[PDB]
């Protein structure tokens, strides 16, 4: 289902943003998780450039720099 699928996200900031904040954050804490800021929501939160539209060319630069360390 859409709500279940949106909560079964691999990124805990996107998951924590909209529903069951407490539950998602508790799960992420006991999982020792990390999210690499790939979804639009994640990058809207931390005030970065979304990987869509005009920010795509930027964010693929960061991808290539992740490639070479």
């Amino acid at each position: 289902g859409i709500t279940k699928a949106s909560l079964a996200t691999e990124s805990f900031i996107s998951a924590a943003s909209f529903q069951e904040t407490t539950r998602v954050l508790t799960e992420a804490a006991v999982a020792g998780k990390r999210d690499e800021l790939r979804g639009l929501k994640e990058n809207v939160i931390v005030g970065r450039l979304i990987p869509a539209g005009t920010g795509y060319a930027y964010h693929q630069d960061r991808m290539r720099r992740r490639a070479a360390g």
């Binding site: 809207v44 450039l49 539209g53 005009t54 920010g55």
Partner: peptide
């Protein structure tokens, strides 16, 4: 409205409306 700008693909208008116009 954040969804609308994400839809347009306008990443720079969004970024300035989040950081330098509001909180940064």
């Amino acid at each position: 409205e954040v969804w609308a700008l994400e839809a347009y693909g306008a990443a720079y208008t969004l970024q300035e409306m989040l950081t330098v116009k509001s909180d940064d």
